[PDB]
Each structure stands twice: as structure tokens, then as C-alpha cells.
């Protein structure tokens, strides 16, 4: 078994230089693909794992020096298998994608900063290895800007930073899975410390063989494209695996740094400047599955976790707090508390006496807690209970009352250290989680409240809601808001659709406001959209009503946004309502989706600028939602550069951002991973808010301005107005067989105007291609300078000193390390009909100048030049990815054309449907965020 | 019961259908489920004092200063129409919120229970619209 030697030479082939000295990338994957290729020659025999291996060589190969031979060589193989095979070597190379994915985490986990290795300036902050540390940022923010460190003390405590769990595109990885990946990691991680004996790393070798085989051995595809339910299962597995440790960690970090400046208080343990939010189970737009019951649901299981994570941690939290010395207050609870009927800890004392006062309160609490979780149980199976709600936490504050006269009692007997800390974890912990773990935020679609208000006024023979101007409709909402008398009833003609937007508001009135965000309008254009949701709002008896987000996701509505925000803070009612704070929710894959990809980020930048103006006009405190798409929304360092990067006080003490599926592994599926996302979404927060980026020249703006136009033009002249666009998307990409096959909901939700921003994203990501993301950037580009040669040294000051300008550009380059155009023309060559042929071949030249043009942008002679360490690991994936490509390509060659019949070859030892779905899963899988 | 009264008739047992089975099926038919049905008794005055709070909230005037004629014009109004009249936001004094949930609890219960709802010092068809409306608007 000399196989081994052919692998580390393609691998070291693949990744060839060290991008320092700890760098171990290409000995973790290549024990992981030894171990892997063995089970899989113990399981499939010995010729299925020399196919696989020859076909892996080849792959790796032509990620190398990109000979189309080689993808010749990989398909002579890929269409000579029967559909076992074929399902066994996607399946193989989605495992084998996987392990070099966790590979690429444990190198990033354990990577050593070099502090040698900064410039000065903020173009370190766009890589983890260089980045500002939170100390860091607070040393920059004394000495350069001259900040005392009270200001920078009191900017954290009313600093919020809140991460908003979504939904993945595709395989929302199942609980299971990612435990498996823990395993492996750590068998990974401890095999490589450096005092390690032989029993123990023979022990660790077998382990991590045993889990690989466990992970290769679980079918990942029957029974449902899983419920809502489950999705949302499976999405908060986060915080059992880091999260919920994570927390209180980094806070704790936050003191130590704040006491190598002089700060001697702590962070005050209620404030929060971590939160989590959530939108499986409550975002509908264009999804029938998401149901009013799939909302109660979710937000009774979020209660249930959130209480056995507390019920679990305060078992340790008692008998840590075993102090009899306490306040006068506290003995006289804990006096109060002994006289009652101590069923959860029979194991631990027969009863709790009151010499330990602290034991009897936390007692108490844990009592509470065990009756929370099993009445929302009680409520989600059946839909009553009969656990009275005076025995349970109801809200959060019932919580925290007992949990701070401990705190407060110990620090007055000099007991602080003892209370800073289990129980200063604890206190964190409530503050930053609640009752909840999330906040779930509701999305729909303006135009079904629009058909709620017209069937409305139609029944009231008043006219239709729909046929009125936008005066009109705002007029008449702004009589009914003010108005003393209900709007509708039972007696009411509604149409399914309408009686779930209905049905939606009555299950929010009926469930605790602890559990809700916000009401987030998707395709917002008008003041008239957010007042109708305010008002059915009213009309539906919340009581505590959710706070209204507009997303405007055309470019026209961003144009119009700053002045309907502006009319809405002008009317008296809604002006005193959202009570000085308004939340407004941009989306970069959606306003690409209609205006290229160029033109919306510039767009998105001005319309900040703009609402901020208003913001201050009225006295209003804004919070910006950066949805998906964004280069805030990227993997690891990058997110540092892109929050430093917005305009100046869009930000000001509150972020908000989409933590996007394909990318919450990688920031929060490791101990040390979770723990620098948090810091540098902390550490940008703050100090965006005292040192904004540099206001953009003015010839900066109108160049912008330009280029944006021509982007525009040629995004919208190949995307809409060439009339064969859509028969060609329909055959180079598996647009149709993705929405027809099981992943997600609804594609559609006409034309690509109806098409959703995901799957045309999806659908171009997965041939390597990655058309929506850089379309238009090209001609933009051409255009500026060929009108004047002094442009490009205009582009090239910008993506120097432009923060804004280089995260654009660089979200680019690095989409376009993850592109082929070669496995693109695989497609056309086989799943596109030949006068088509010219077409495509004209789109890949675009692909091909824009890159040209980016590089020229960026400085660059080869892509990614600045951050080394990224461009290896993409190599080290696109190996993997590409045999997945070819495999993808001919199976649908095979699916659409039963008159293609191929030469099988014998099966090889122990449905092209499913083969599909492996390389979509794992293309997926390696590709991660683009656009 | 009645299945088994047809059934004894049809094979001649007409005669054993006629004794306790007869009595039973008179007994079920007498009282039903309730021995009695229940009615209601309240004054007008009561439910002129609701609609009166009704219309002073709605800034419409004050139904008691109406005069019969105008009380019956716009009751009419709204039985007749399509949208509800009142909800929880609405200033209830102590016999205002009496009326109100005496028909909550008519709502609630089975319609087996209850006869006539009967109104002391009726003297004019408002004051027999009125309850027609309360009722109706009490779901
Ligand atoms: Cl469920
Ligand atoms: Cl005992």
C-alpha cells in the first residue's frame, strides 16, 4: 500500500509553498484522504478505491495547470459507471470535500498570529492572521484617535451586536453530522500536540478512522426535505456545540482587555452586546411550507432548549454557590422560599437547609426552570397544559431578579470574586440568550398584506385597496390607525392565502413577545407598505406589536427609500410608536438579481448615506439589517475590512447582520472560530462607531455613478432584453432540475424577474461560473478607461484607500478563485444545443476580461495575491469540487436525454437521481458563499 | 331512542315500545338537555347606557340624545352592515361591562339553554333593535 505516495505528491503539488510554518494543510488532508480511501477500499473493495483515487489524481491535476485533457480523462471514467457506482463515487467525493473542508478549520483555528506581519493600516484588517485583536482595536482607538478609555468603556455597553440565523440554501447539515465533524477535528487537532505518547496517539489514530467511517456510513438524503421544524433543529445546534459556552468566554475576554487599559469595572452582565436571532420558522416569503403552525411551533421548541440549557448549567451553578454569608435581603428570600413543599435533587441533598441561602434560591429557580421547559413542551404536543403559568419564567425579568440579589448579596459580603464567576457566566448568559436562545423575526411578501387590505375593503364596498394611489392608501390607513373602532371579523370572505397572513398575526398575538423580532417586508417600496402591517398589527390584538423592517430590494425602491422612510417618520402616530428606533433591511443578492451586482453595492452605500441623514433629521436612532449577499456576510477575516467599511454612523452602537447557512460552520462550528467571530464583529462595532472610513473623494463618487450606469446596461441587456438568456440558463445550469428536485421551496414567485435571488445565485454557483455575481463589472470597467488613461490609477487609489471600494472588489476576486470557465464549457458542450454554443462562448470571454480587469483593479498579477492562505485552501477544495463538476454534468446529460446511451462498465462490490443530488449537496458544500 | 322505537314497531312490538321507551322519548322531548331554557331579563335603559358609551367613543354623539326616529336610522345601519362595532379598547363603566358579558356568556353556552331575551320598559323599536345588535356584535 504505496498509494500514500501518490497522494501527498498531488497533494503537495496542489498546495506547494507554506504560507508560514505551522502550516500542517497538507498533512491534515493528507492523513484524512489515507484514512478515508482505506475504509473506503475496506468497504467497496479494492477496485472501487483505485477508481476513485485515479480519478482524485487527475482532479487535482487539472486544478494545477488547468489541461482539458484532464477533463476529458475525468469524464471517459464518470459516464462509464452503472448508477451504483455513480452514486458511490459522488457520495465518496462529497466525504472526501468534507474532510478537506475540516482540515481548512482546525489550520484556521490554530494558525499563530504575526504580529510582525501588520502594515499599519486597515487593509490588515481583512484577514485573520493580521486583523485587530479586541485589545488591539482598544490601543488603536487610544492612541491614534486619542479616545479615553471611560468613552470606549461606555460606547460597549450600549453597543449591540446581533446575529440573525438563517436558513442554508441547501443541505441544512443535521445535528449528527456536525457532531461528526467535532470528532473528527479533535482526533485531528490532539494528534499533532507535540508531547503526544504512542498509546495515546495509537488510540486517537483509530478514533478518528472510526469516525470518518461513521460519517461515510449515514444516508444523508431520504425520508423529507426536512420540515421547518426540523431545519430549525438542526440550525440551533450551534449553541449546544459553541455558542453557548462561547458567550460568557468572550465576555470575560472583553474584562481582561478592558483591564489592560485601566478599565476596573466589567462589562455590566446585563448588557446586550451579543444577541441571536432567527428566521427558520418565520420568514414565508415565497415558502407555503412555513405555516402559522410552523411559527408556534419553533417558538415553543426555542423556549424548550433554552430552558434545559439553563436547567442543566444551574445543577453546577449550586454547588458552586455553597456560601452561607449573605444580605439581609437574600435571607430574608431564602427564609420565604423554606417554607413551601426539592424533587430535582435527591441525587445531590435530601433538602436544601437554609445555612445555604444561595442553594435554597437557585433551587428555587431550577424548580421554575423544570416547569418552563415541560409546560412549552406541554403546550407544543397538545395546545393546552396544565402547569399554572405563576410556576414558570414568563418573562425575562422573573428570571433575573433572584439570579441578581445573589449577585448583589455576595458582592456585598467581598464575595465578588465567588460571584464573578459561574454565576457571572450565568447572568451573561440570561441576558445574552433569554428565555428564547433566538428571536424569531416574521417575513412576508408587501403584496399578501396588500391583498388582506383590498379583500378588506372590498367587503366593506369602499373600493379596492389595490386600485388607490399611494396617497390614497396612506390616507386611509392613517384614518383607521387613529381610529376607535375594529376593522373585521369572522364575517369575512378570505382566500387561503389571505387567512394565513391572518392566521400568522393571531399566533403572534398568543405567544410571548420575548420570542419575536421583527416583521420584515419583503419587496417594500412605499410608506403604505409598513403602516398596512402596522395596522393589521393593531387589528389582530398584538399587544406588544413587532417592529416593522422594510426590505427594499429593487434598485428604484432603494432610490425611493430615504424619502418613504422620511414620510413615515413624519406622521404623528408612527413617529410615536417605534418609540425613537427604526430598523431597515437591505439585500445585496436581491437589488444584484435586478441591477448586476456593481450597481446595487454602490446603491447600497448611497442609500445608507441617505437614511442616516434622515435618521438624524428626526431624531431617530437607525439599525441597518445587512441581509444576504453582503461582504459582511463573508467567512472569517473579511467581515473585519467590511464593517469598517460602512458609510460613516450607519452603524452607530447596533449592528445587524445575516449569518449566512453555508457559512455558520465555518465561523461557529470550532471553540476558537466562534470566539473570533464574536470579537471581530465586537471589535468593528466599536470601532466604527468612533473612526469611520474616509469620505469618498468626489470624483470617487461620480466615477461610481458612471460606472454603474454602463454595469447596468450590459447586466440588463444579457439578463433581460437577449431573448434566448433564458433558454440558455434553462440547459448550462441546473436552475430547473433544482427547484423541481427537493431543496428549499418555491424558485419562483414569468422570467428571471419572478425567479428568486437564491436560486439564481444556486443555479450559476454550481457550474462554477458564478455569472451573477460579477456581471457588469467588466464593461464598467472597459468603460472608464478607455474614456480617460487616467481611470485606472483612479480605480487603483480606490481599492488602496477606499474601504468600501476594495471589500467590493475583493468579494470579486474571491469569487472568481472559486470559478472555472473551462468546467463551464463542460456544461455547454454537453446539456446545450449547439447554436447556443456562440452565446455562451461570449459569456465566458466577458468572464474572462472582467477577471483581467479585476486583477488590474486589485494590483494583482494572479488572484487573491494579498491573502495566500485563502487561495490554498479554495485549491485544496475546487480538487474535490471539479470530479464533482464533471460527475454533475454528464448525470444531467444522462437525466434530460434518454437518447444518449452510454457504455457501462461492471459494477464495482458492495437511481441518477440521487447521484444529482450528491454533487448539488457537495458542490454546494465546497463552493460555500459567492454571492 | 328513536332508532329503537322504529325498531320495536317494525316487528310488532308496538306495544313494548309504548311503555318506558314511550315515556322516555316524552321525557327527552319535555325537558331536553336542560329541564328549562333560561331567559334573560335587563332593563333598556341598560343597553341604551351601552350603545350611549358607544357612540360618545366613536365621536358619532350620544345615541341617547337621538331621537327615535334617528336611533333607528343608524341601528339600522348597522345590522346591516359588514363591520364590527366595538372591541376591548372601549371605556366600560361597572353596568356597562355587566351587559356586555352577560352576552359573552350567552355566546359561550349552548343555544339548548336559553329562551327569550327579555327587555323591562321596552316602549319603542330601538329598544328592541339594540339587543338584536348587542347580540349580533357579541359574537
Ligand atoms: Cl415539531
Ligand atoms: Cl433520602
Known amino acids: 500500500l504505496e498509494k500514500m505516495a501518490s497522494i501527498d505528491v498531488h497533494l503537495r503539488q496542489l498546495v506547494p509553498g507554506k504560507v508560514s510554518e505551522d502550516d500542517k494543510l497538507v498533512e491534515y488532508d493528507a492523513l484524512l484522504l489515507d484514512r478515508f480511501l482505506d475504509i473506503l477500499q475496506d468497504l467497496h473493495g479494492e477496485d472501487l478505491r483505485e477508481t476513485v483515487q485515479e480519478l482524485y489524481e487527475h482532479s487535482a491535476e487539472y486544478e494545477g495547470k488547468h489541461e482539458p485533457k484532464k477533463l476529458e480523462e475525468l469524464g471517459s471514467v464518470l459516464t462509464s459507471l452503472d448508477p451504483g457506482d455513480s452514486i458511490v463515487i459522488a457520495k465518496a467525493f462529497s466525504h472526501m470535500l468534507n474532510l478537506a473542508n475540516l482540515a481548512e478549520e482546525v489550520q484556521i483555528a490554530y494558525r499563530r498570529r504575526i504580529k510582525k506581519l501588520k ?4 487593509v490588515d484588517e481583512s484577514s485573520a492572521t493580521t486583523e485587530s485583536d479586541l485589545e488591539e482595536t482598544f490601543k488603536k482607538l487610544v492612541g491614534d484617535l486619542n479616545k479615553s478609555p471611560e468613552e470606549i468603556f461606555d460606547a460597549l455597553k450600549n453597543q449591540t451586536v446581533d446575529l440573525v440565523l438563517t436558513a442554508h440554501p441547501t443541505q441544512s447539515v443535521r445535528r449528527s453530522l456536525l457532531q461528526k465533524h467535532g470528532r473528527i477535528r479533535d482526533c485531528l487537532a490532539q494528534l499533532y500536540a507535540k508531547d503526544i505518547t504512542p498509546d495515546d496517539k495509537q488510540e486517537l489514530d483509530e478514533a478518528l478512522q472510526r469516525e470518518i467511517q461513521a460519517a461515510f456510513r449515514t444516508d444523508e438524503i431520504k425520508r423529507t426535505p426536512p420540515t421547518p421544524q426540523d431545519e430549525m433543529r438542526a440550525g440551533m445546534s450551534y449553541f449546544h456545540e459553541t455558542i453557548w459556552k462561547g458567550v460568557p468566554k468572550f465576555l470575560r475576554r472583553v474584562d481582561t482587555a478592558l483591564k489592560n487599559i485601566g478599565i476596573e469595572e466589567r462589562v455590566p452582565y446585563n448588557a ?12 414565508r416569503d415565497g415558502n407555503p411550507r412555513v405555516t402559522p403552525e410552523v411559527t408556534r411551533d419553533v417558538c415553543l421548541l426555542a423556549r424548550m432548549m433554552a430552558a434545559t440549557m439553563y436547567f442543566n448549567q444551574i445543577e453546577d451553578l449550586m454547588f458552586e454557590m455553597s456560601m452561607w454569608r449573605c444580605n439581609d435581603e437574600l435571607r430574608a428570600r431564602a427564609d420565604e422560599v423554606h417554607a413551601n413543599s426539592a424533587k430535582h435533587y435527591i441525587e445531590f441533598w435530601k433538602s436544601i437547609p437554609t445555612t445555604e441561602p444561595y442553594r435554597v434560591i437557585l433551587g428555587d429557580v431550577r424548580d421554575k426552570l423544570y416547569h418552563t421547559r415541560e409546560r ?20 425575562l425579568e422573573q428570571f433575573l431578579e433572584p439570579l441578581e440579589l445573589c449577585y448583589r448579596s455576595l458582592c456585598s459580603c467581598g464575595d465578588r470574586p465567588i460571584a464573578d464567576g459561574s454565576l457571572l457566566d450565568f447572568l451573561r448568559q440570561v441576558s445574552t440568550f433569554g428565555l428564547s436562545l433566538v428571536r424569531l423575526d416574521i417575513r412576508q411578501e408587501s403584496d399578501r398584506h396588500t391583498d388582506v387590505l383590498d379583500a378588506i375593503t372590498t367587503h366593506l364596498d369602499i373600493g379596492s385597496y389595490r386600485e388607490w394611489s399611494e396617497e390614497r392608501r396612506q390616507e386611509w390607513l392613517l384614518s383607521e390607525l387613529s381610529g376607535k373602532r375594529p376593522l373585521f371579523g369572522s364575517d369575512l370572505p378570505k382566500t387561503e392565502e389571505i387567512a394565513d397572513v391572518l392566521d400568522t398575526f393571531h399566533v403572534i398575538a398568543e405567544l410571548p413577545a420575548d420570542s419575536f423580532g421583527a416583521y420584515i417586508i419583503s419587496m417594500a417600496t412605499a410608506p403604505s407598505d409598513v403602516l398596512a402591517v402596522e395596522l393589521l398589527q393593531r387589528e389582530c390584538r398584538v399587544k406588544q406589536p413587532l417592529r416593522v423592517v422594510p426590505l427594499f430590494e429593487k434598485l428604484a425602491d432603494l432610490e425611493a427609500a430615504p424619502a418613504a422612510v422620511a414620510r413615515l417618520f413624519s406622521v404623528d402616530w408612527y413617529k ?3 418609540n425613537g428606533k427604526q430598523e431597515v433591511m437591505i439585500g445585496y443578492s436581491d437589488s444584484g438579481k435586478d441591477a448586476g451586482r456593481l450597481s446595487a453595492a454602490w446603491q447600497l452605500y448611497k442609500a445608507q448615506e441617505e437614511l442616516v441623514k434622515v435618521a438624524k433629521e428626526y431624531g431617530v436612532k437607525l439599525t441597518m439589517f445587512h441581509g444576504r449577499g453582503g461582504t459582511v456576510g463573508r467567512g472569517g477575516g473579511p467581515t473585519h475590512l467590511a464593517i469598517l467599511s460602512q458609510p460613516p454612523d450607519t452603524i452607530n452602537g447596533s449592528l445587524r447582520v445575516t449569518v449566512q447557512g453555508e457559512v455558520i460552520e465555518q465561523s461557529f462550528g470550532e471553540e476558537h472560530l466562534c470566539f473570533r467571530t464574536l470579537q471581530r464583529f465586537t471589535a468593528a462595532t466599536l470601532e466604527h462607531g468612533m473612526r469611520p472610513p474616509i469620505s469618498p473623494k468626489p470624483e470617487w463618487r461620480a466615477l461610481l455613478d458612471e460606472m454603474a450606469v454602463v454595469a447596468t446596461e450590459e447586466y440588463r441587456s444579457v439578463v433581460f432584453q437577449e431573448p434566448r438568456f433564458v433558454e440558455y440558463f434553462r440547459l448550462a445550469t441546473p436552475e430547473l432540475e433544482y427547484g423541481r428536485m427537493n431543496i428549499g421551496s418555491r ?20 457550474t462554477r461560473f458564478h455569472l451573477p455575481v460579477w456581471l457588469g463589472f467588466g464593461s464598467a470597467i472597459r468603460h472608464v478607461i478607455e474614456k480617460d488613461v487616467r481611470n485606472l490609477h483612479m480605480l487603483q487609489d480606490m481599492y488602496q484607500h477606499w474601504p468600501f471600494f476594495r471589500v467590493t472588489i475583493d468579494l470579486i476576486e474571491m469569487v472568481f478563485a472559486k470559478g472555472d470557465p473551462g468546467i463551464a464549457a463542460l456544461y455547454d458542450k454537453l446539456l446545450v444545443s449547439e447554436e447556443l454554443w456562440p452565446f455562451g462562448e461570449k459569456l465566458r470571454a466577458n468572464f474572462e476580461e472582467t ?24 485549491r485544496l477544495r475546487d480538487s474535490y469540487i471539479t470530479t464533482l463538476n464533471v460527475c454533475q454534468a454528464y448525470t444531467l446529460k444522462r437525466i434530460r436525454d434518454p437518447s444518449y446511451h452510454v457504455t457501462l462498465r461492471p459494477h464495482i462490490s458492495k437511481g441518477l437521481e440521487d447521484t444529482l443530488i450528491l454533487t448539488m449537496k457537495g458542490i454546494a458544500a465546497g463552493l460555500q458563499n459567492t454571492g
Open 272 to 283: 446586550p452586546l451579543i444577541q441571536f436571532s432567527s428566521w427558520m420558522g418565520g420568514d
Open 747 to 766: 424558485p419562483s414567485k414569468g422570467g428571471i424577474e419572478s425567479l428568486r435571488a437564491i436560486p439564481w445565485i444556486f443555479a450559476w454557483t454550481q
Open 576 to 578: 410615536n410608536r417605534i
Open 851 to 874: 477577471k483581467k480587469l479585476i486583477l488590474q483593479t486589485a494590483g494583482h498579477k494572479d488572484l487573491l495575491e494579498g491573502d495566500p492562505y485563502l487561495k490554498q485552501g479554495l
Open 376 to 395: 412549552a413542551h406541554q403546550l407544543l404536543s397538545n395546545g393546552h397544559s396544565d402547569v399554572p403559568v405563576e410556576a414558570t419564567f414568563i418573562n
Open 119 to 122: 502594515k499599519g493600516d486597515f
